[PDB]
């Protein structure tokens with residue numbers, strides 16, 4: 001089997017159904033002790049939690065679910081009725097994410113879409129009845145952070161105050177995105193320095209709040 005299947009199995013055998021916190025803990029244990037994986041992790045995850053609590057978004061889009069760690073992290077803090085849409089390009093990982101969310105008891109809050117961000121973003125309004133997004137978590141291909149931000153804007157999915165939160169802006173790094181949002185009058189940016197998941201390597205999150213045209 002694959003690493004991702006092993007992570008799911010470990011959660012199923014070491015966490016409590018319906019207990020998101022136990023799911024996060026199980027994933028972090030496995031990835032610290034057994035096999036590294038590209039989940040956002042606990043260090044950056046704590047920063048994400050603080051942001052989600054500050055903004056209490058009603059509708060969140062995640063780009064790049066992987067195994068569902070971040071989707072569990074965000075969805076467990078959403079208010080009743082609030083929703084997460086998450087996109088995952090790898091079909092095997094999309095299925096793992098669905099199963100992860102099901103185990104965590106968060107499946108009614110989250111819709112996991114299998115496909116590429118460039119294809120799915122233009123369908124959000126008419127197919128998924130999205131008006132505007134309250135928050136976007138960028139965690140997909142690092143080359144796509146900038147084009148997909150621009151595409152979100154083109155599609156009319158951003159409003160004044162939409163929060164973009166970007167993983168991995170240092171490692172692997174997203175230099176074009178960072179330069180762009182930090183240089184743009186349409187964004188108010190803050191950097192949260194942290195560490196790459198499960199590693200003693202500096203990484204960070206960027207928050208970029210959309211200001212309108």
Ligand SMILES: Cc1cc(-c2n[nH]c(CCNC(=O)c3cc(-c4ccc(F)cc4)cc(O)c3O)n2)ccn1
Pocket residue numbers: 038039040063064065066087088089090115116117118120139140141142144167168171172196197
């Ligand atoms: C809908 C759609 C979805 C996607 C999509 N789905 N899933 C992803 C995952 C992307 N993530 C990464 O590659 C990533 C890599 C590292 C890393 C690797 C190796 C190192 F040595 C150091 C760090 C660390 C991380 O935290 C990462 O997030 N993209 C893509 C396109 N369209």
Ligand SMILES: [Cl-]
Pocket residue numbers: 038039040041065066067068069070071
């Ligand atoms: Cl993750």
Ligand SMILES: [Cl-]
Pocket residue numbers: 040041042043044196197198199
């Ligand atoms: Cl960590």
Ligand SMILES: [Mg+2]
Pocket residue numbers: 038039040139167168
């Ligand atoms: Mg990441």
